[model samples]
Target: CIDGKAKIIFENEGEEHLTTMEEMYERYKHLGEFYDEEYNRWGIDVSNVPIYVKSFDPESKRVVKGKVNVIWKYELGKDVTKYEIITNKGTKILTSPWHPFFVLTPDFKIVEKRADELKEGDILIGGMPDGEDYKFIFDYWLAGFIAGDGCFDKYHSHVKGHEYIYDRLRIYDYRIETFEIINDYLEKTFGRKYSIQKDRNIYYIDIKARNITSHYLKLLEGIDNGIPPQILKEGKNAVLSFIAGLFDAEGHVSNKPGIELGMVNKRLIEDVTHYLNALGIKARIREKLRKDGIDYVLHVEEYSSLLRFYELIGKNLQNEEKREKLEKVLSNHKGGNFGLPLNFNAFKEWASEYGVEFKTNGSQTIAIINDERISLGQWHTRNRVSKAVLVKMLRKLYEATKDEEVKRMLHLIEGLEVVRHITTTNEPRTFYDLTVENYQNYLAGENGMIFVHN
Candidate 1:
């Protein structure tokens, strides 16, 4: 029932300018906040204008060519007395009278040689060459223009910090190592810093400085691990179980577990106890002690090679199945054949032959069992008999097996819960009576009879 595919097509045929017109109207409606009310206009502010001046044509006298225009009602009339313009460089340019508005284009030819010394935000104006007549208007306009430009560019562009002026937006490939290198460079260049930490295979980085604080850094760390402390603490066991499920193998014990088992290797024990004085279990030798009763005495010495091998294997298993399998195989054998019984007397005799005195610690037997139960009081489920019968047979097999390795294998199979569900057409059946009837009928067949009845 879960198989379907479809294609959808959408079409819209309208006036080309409809969207533009709507957007323009929306901007116009919000003009009070977005536009300059004092200037009664829209678009970018030009008060802090950057103007370049050069000599006029024909190699004649220099002229003020840069112009600033203001739209006004035509009835205001172009009267020279209504306006006044002044230039900061001794006001050499012509001063024109203003009506409702005027265009003040300044000439910079007189001061072109001094252009290199001029820093940004420096202002120049246009007006008469003399005193008080132009100073008042020139000073007022220059200050107002600078202030307006500052507000428009600084606040509107939302620029902050010295680096922001040169900052460019970019996309990264989403790699932790790349992030670490970039962060390191940023720290050196901009005085920012961070640290990376990993716990139980989960990794996180903590960034410092900027607007973000240590609290935010900690929060990000918590987010990287999925559940926050509050949730994890509330359901500690359940969360651990969920995490365990994620790392669990499909059909056997985890390679991590096998590696853990391998830590008890015979060579490891000798290196740890005798060579290094390190108090750790050795899987290979432990298996030997369990399989054969021979034990060797050790003295204090360094076991750097053994420790290095453990670390190397531990890190190698990450994200690699083959490495995990190799670890499992190595953990199970200590220079011995797989599934072969270790002979304690033969091992001791061989050690004596090599002039090595070995003592006997007797064999250690390990037993493990896994079981689950589902009860139906007076009601038979769909495949109740088959399920129950399989479970019973597995339990019987476990009880009958004396071989420790084989018993461990059977225990793992039983722990998998193969007989827990009743399926028809590979789907679970809900009817208890039907399940029981079907289970009984299936068991009456040849193969099923051999398993269930025989």
Candidate 2:
């Protein structure tokens, strides 16, 4: 919801409000928009967004917020109950499994609940808090870019015979101009000025306020981390905003296929994939190797997801260069008819079946399968290092490890678990993806490190 009183202070009072909604819509359409095909509606088409009436009956439906083009209705065989919810921005819809919808329970304690988890008695927030304040900046949108290229390091100092400890949060980028713009954003958003530090090829700004820094430490305590947890609990706007920041920082897009992000913090990427489904976007994460270390990579593969990514997140990014690349990727489908989307389980089973060694982050597809330290990213770039090809690459170890065999690929024809591989599509040959399953798998894969492969 637009704040009436605060706009005078936050916005230029004398500024002309000349941009029309249609103009803004036109400008953004080139960025990205999703057509539902059946509904002939763009996913971000706010002009006629679904306006579900706030009520107890799951059957209750109507468009009170936006103009109803057609009253789309569907029947579920079983009884289904849903809460009617609306954001302050006039968005109204039934509760779904994607985003976080706040709830006040019988005990009077307010808690964040996934849309599907809302039960009989609970009052929903008419709107959610933006999650950023003058005292600190840890909003979902802010956190993503920061988490994408952010870090918090604690240190102690001795001054005037007093000892002080600081939990410093820092956001860094390599481009001088871009970092200046980001610092400009920080200054404008929080009314705080930051000086940048040059570290070889990159520049950074470190925040040193012990006052609210530790408080945010609480915000990051999911899977033993912060704002990612907090942002995941906020509204849809907050979720997308956070992703905008993330993509601005570490997100990679190309004309090749989907968007990919390489990150050292695996859980953070996990958080991205988890909530993307809120808007019906499907994303997957895999692992890759670098000259120095292993990193996690998040990929959004489908066109539908591409639509959602552009409309919801990429369109709002501040980095023009990154945005341009993202636009190229989104505007150009360029689907890779090359590889299959396989989870860790299925890939591992295939490895065992071939008497070939498979190394991975225990979760993500990232690994050095043979005695050599080549990761999947390395193998992929090489383009021909799968079961048929890699076995030759490991010729020396092949005959020696031929005796190392067995299998548990999981098939009632259902599929494998996290690291498990699911069969490739209509294609005769298999080229699959990897998974770094739950938090445990992420951490296990982290510890799996080289997996003894040199």
Candidate 3:
């Protein structure tokens, strides 16, 4: 059973929203909707609500579609203990002890274990399947770019011998590379050329043709209302491309090495954060009060996420300088705190390959690097290792190790995050669970990364 505070990923009318179990229970309980009086339980049929959930396939290891057969809400005993599972990815799963999570063993075998059975080092699995296919290669990207920087408006202009009015969609930027890319797409598809204009340092392309402007307007229609439900359902390739375009248009790599995208739209920032989390990357949203108004900033600060973003979207960035700066920041960054739990045995073996010496005593192992001895036993005994020590050694090892095959191993580890802590509390609260059709498990909790067994 999951705690009342646990947030479940819910989809209604194609739009995804996170709703806490408590809220769901409260909303229905008051309305007297499908309440089982004797059992003191509430049931929500998804068909009545037109809501669906993303369910997990243990066999295929993918998050797939699920129509929740029924949502069950029940009151738990006052003595029931709640286990809060916190991961390095900054996601938390709050559940009852009997709740099972999808975890990984040392050999990378996926297994299901109840919250009470899980330890600090147990690795949780999060995966996103290739969603429904996209309409065109540039469709999602164009949508994202427009969401970030595209402007839809009209202007009056006087040409040599005629009076003309133009309704245009435009993006103002000085990046010729970006312009060339967009121009290529427009020319190839519409058989039309965009009119380019410049004002001092900024250059912009104006799509004055009624058909082109209308087409772009249609693609970008629902962004102001947050991410259009349709765009969120697209495959990873399209989603990533969209993100790349957005980053190219509005995001920047600061000298402080932080990748940030800021705007006055809180919903847009939240949407981006959700998209990033769905892709197995963690991002945080921060709100600041500016002179004009409130500005929301989405920060991709974790080193591992930065690397993932670089690999996935940075390479495709239309902003050449931003991409180049990101590359430089990555090469300079080392010994980062974010990563999968370092497999002590695998790490020892890998360290030995780089001429690092190790001394093992019974169950304890120590690494002697640069004549300094460091214990590696914490990884086994406490199921925790000093990230600083381990990552520092990784930096040194990365420089010393030359094989690309060996480097690939590090990259894989970087892609996954470890469970940092598990805290328990016995608070008087209610519990909830879903009876999903066919599938037994669904994704839940903060960040929607928790693979929950229903």
Candidate 4:
């Protein structure tokens, strides 16, 4: 049985939602029941309702959406223990040993491995958040874009010797494409388009606050200071659209193959990072020392994260150049190996097995195995093996010994990571599992960062 507290991510009406297995059981226990003839017992079974969730598609190795056919639970015995497996990425899976997890073997194969069979260094494969289409909300996107580059303020004015307050909204950018899109949106949304005005080398759209409808005002409320809490609470699609708009306005695609967004407003950067995490995409924020002053830059660096960003948010970016650059960087390294993490001691022994010589001097690393000058990039106490290096070693072993096992080890390691450790609880506790429709395996995790089987 899976842990009662482990939550499952599902979609409803194009919005993502989550509920713990215990919560599902508690809410639906009275709705239905079934009998187990083999065990001669009655258990909770609620299969009438349709619930949408994601599952691993073995053929494509990508997580896709489907309906959950059933939700059932029953006690195993008076005393049952749970097992937990933590991966290299710090993804913790808590459940019974009988639970199955998607695993990649040294033999270059993907299969479901029982939690009891998992050991240190065994590789696990999983998927990200939902991989389905979602409807776009232009208002949410406009709010985010304004937050990044739009100016909103009020000034006191004299009209007929009477004091009057005038609120103004201005979005400044050099790109005509950006304004073109905004003009179309404004015309369609508010039935009016503001003319473009230029200052120095930048172009901007100036609008009076009174001209905008109350509907838009509600959505853009509190956006000048930070993201409105109510807007973030709406739906996942809206949150993603907002991020896309923000990225289009301030995000940059680096030749170093990174996605970055920077702002002088620390709180705004913090809010953006928090939203990214909530959407199952990881990000980091650091204080950057710029020529002008300090700026907070949020960075998306992980392989899975980059891919997820491309699929979920990057694709929706309004800036054509930034969106294209992101796609190109992602495509250049698509399906590339994720290289295994090897400790120094393990590398030493593994290198000797392949008749390779290794040496290090003053923060430098290299391995002399293929009669060529092979550099291992940066020098570190821990040797992180690359996919190319591992492939070379596997090929050499296969050629010398004609071992099919060694040949099988040459398979690409995309979408896989090694398990770091496993823990079994000594105390007795109940466990649970899910029976997802179409695919037997369901993606389960706390942070939506890792995926597992039912």
Candidate 5:
């Protein structure tokens, strides 16, 4: 999986040698003797040593003409090393003290020496192809490292050596010097400092001096403090002030011409009162006055005419079902119809008790009592404005209210629609548009309802 070669290449000889089992066993026995002697000398003990031969190929079948390779393994600690073969009759290959015929160590010194020896042995194994005159062609090559006397015990030495070095020296030192060199270079280049301290007879590298200081300084600038002065305080204040000016000194309902504007103001006052009550504060609506005593007031006269219009409409809708359905439609309309349920029965009873006459044409109804008129469309408009204004006023009230109930209510209403809209729009849009469309075409009306306009 690492480099895509699953099976190891055994040998790549220009010509295959058909050796007997005895000959192969003899070669293997020589290797075993070398390992046993080396292990004893190094005082290394291993539970098992297994060798395996994977495959063989003849020279005639070789792609590159030259040397041969043999792949084998010695069951050492963790990894397996491969071995190569390249020698002619009477050719004397240099014999190393550890691996008499082949270099066995993966260490740089031994590998460099092995490369030189292989070159001297005149083995053209890898690289470009040559003419047939080269006699032997090598398609594959296998080379193995020798588990030298010290190599097998290197791990134990490393652990013990590091402990002593770390504890006694009061400085960090790695057996591989490259790491120390890199650390030195980084310190000098970056102007970073480290602590070389000794604790409990152990040397330690302290990273806190450099890393902690940098992070601490960065946080002092205050990156994510939630309420940025420029964005939240200043910007929000400007907006609220502009909106606050639209109303009179007293929170008087305005004689606005816009659809349901009068009702919107009334709703705003109600919403603000409700929000304050939620925060355990009692609030009330009063007439707008130029005096300093009142916190908020509404100019009832400005909106008086609009209120009368809504009163007339309220008397017209007598049928409960029709009124409810119409209210629902108006509430969903873009004019901020908040869809709050209006008590038609209460209005009717109140009008009747007060001697107000209710009159209706085929399509419209009106109520007249004490010169106040309430009609169907006006009532709808008023309801919409009342809900919208109430919601807006509630937002400001909740901001000043610190009670738990007020906080909870503010959170519940503020972005409730935002969350619902996000879920609805994202969840089924693609599936309903594409997959459902396809499915419906194939199974229309077979299951239940067919596509219909609402």
Candidate 6:
């Protein structure tokens, strides 16, 4: 039999995979013990935990008679830089490349997988509520919800810092039908009870299932950093469902001409942007000012990107308003232009307003405009200029400037949207050149530079 007493080619749990799996049964079996006496008491039989074995011997014509807990070269360990699997009559040792010399070895790691993720033929490893009755996708989608509008917080009814003890997962939305569908899904997948409550127009599924909720939040954190390491690890349909769940919670389409999603954490939105890009949805990151602070917004504009968004998240969208909004954008409006604009002169005045001036100027040197030194570029980069002010300036320019070329440039978005970035490292000459071109063209930018601190 290929199954027999095995040795790990590499170290893990300071032993073979077989030994580790056996050990985990005894350690984590207490939970399974509470309800089912047979499994609860002993955890599980070693056979219940299926393990795979692969033979590393290429030269042998016969299948390796004994199991080697891993072709076990390693994932969470020091990778085998060089190695030869030793099949010796006398030697029980695995030889690393001339490794009579090695001192340091890789650290131990026990990566995890969900049980339902396990396929019929597969070993244990295994969400969403919409279409198929799949647990993993539904679970992931709920996690997506957590990363979106949902957050892990104390309901004040529990011990501090012990969310798992009384996990308070709150995911609420105004779309009650969307709430209804997802609740149905959550009910089918997670047999635990949900505290369904309604307020005015909104519906919220409030409940606690302890570790599951807390554990779910962690999964969301790992995915959002919005590009997930597991995006490709899981199949496309499932991950897309997860993203759709997130969009249903935090994504916005009705307020603007394009799709915008708000996030408290920039990294998560950035990750979202990254994954959206992967899904052929072009998106940009923006910082919106609110009472609380700067919120990261992921914006997806244009017809193609919108189509891509619909393709990715639209299919399973639970939000009725958002779905209608997306449909309206696709059908009713082929073009859109909307934003806060104070007025035309407002832009002119702001465009002329002087800022704290730097000492030296050359190619970037500007003769004071109407006795005031204007640094719209600097103001913009410093968050001193609001979109309302700038767009208003552009509006005034368009209404009054009769020149055909000027009118043409004024009407165009590229001329209006792009702003020059200014800093010490930024080429002042280039900034000035861009500014001059902007003045001649229409007017309106991110530079990522690693500033040396040491």
RMSD of 3: 6.9
Candidate 1 lDDT (Cα, whole model)? 0.23
Number of the candidate with higher TM-score, 2 or 3: 3
At residue 416, candidate 1 shows an lDDT of: 16
Q: Estimate each model's TM-score.
A: 0.15, 0.43, 0.70, 0.58, 0.16, 0.42
Flag clash pairs in model 4. Answer: 1-431, 1-432, 2-432
lDDT (Cα, tens digit) per residue for candidate 4, span 200-249: 98999987757663445577676545456556556677877887888888
CA lDDT of 110 in candidate 4?
68
Selected candidate, larger TM-score, 5 vs 6: 6
Candidate 1 residue runs with Cα over 4 Å from true position: 1-318, 321-327, 330-454
lDDT of each: 0.23, 0.42, 0.68, 0.65, 0.24, 0.40
**In angstroms, how far off is 92's CA in candidate 6?**
55
lDDT by residue (273-358, candidate 1, tens digit) is 22111111111122334454554322211121222223322332222453465445444432211111123343234224323333
- Candidate closest to the true structure, highest lDDT: 3
Note each model's CA RMSD in angstroms.
Answer: 40.6, 22.1, 6.9, 9.7, 40.3, 24.3
Candidate 2, lDDT over the whole model: 0.42
| Top-scoring candidate (TM-score) | 3
lDDT of 4: 0.65
Instruction: Give one digit per residue, the lDDT tens place, for model 2 in 145-178.
Output: 6666778888677777769877888778877666
Estimate, for each residue in 135-227, the C-alpha lDDT of model 5 and write its tens digit: 110100000000000011111225654642121111222222322432464476556545454556444443433343343233222212311
lDDT of 3 by residue, 1-454 (tens): 6777665556666656545667765655543458789978767665565657767666655557787766787776656778888876667777878888777666545678898998876777653323223233576777778778788887777876767887778887776667787788888888887667788988888778777887767666666655654565544565667777788888979755669988887766776676676654557677878997999888876666676667677887767888999999877764443334446665566557667887877766677766767665446444345433453455455566665544534433433446788998877766788877787877666644566886
On residues 1-454, what C-alpha lDDT tens digit does candidate 6 reach at each position?
0011111111122222112222333433543422234422222222233322212111221112122221111111143232212110011111222222111011111122221121122110000001113223566676667667675665555556763445577777776666666668666767665656887877787766765675675565554343354443454555667777788788788635688888777766755554444333446677899896899888876444565467557756767778888878766533332221223233334334332222224322222333344323323223233332332333344444433433322222111121112111111110000001111110000111000000
User: Better model by TM-score, 2 or 4?
Assistant: 4
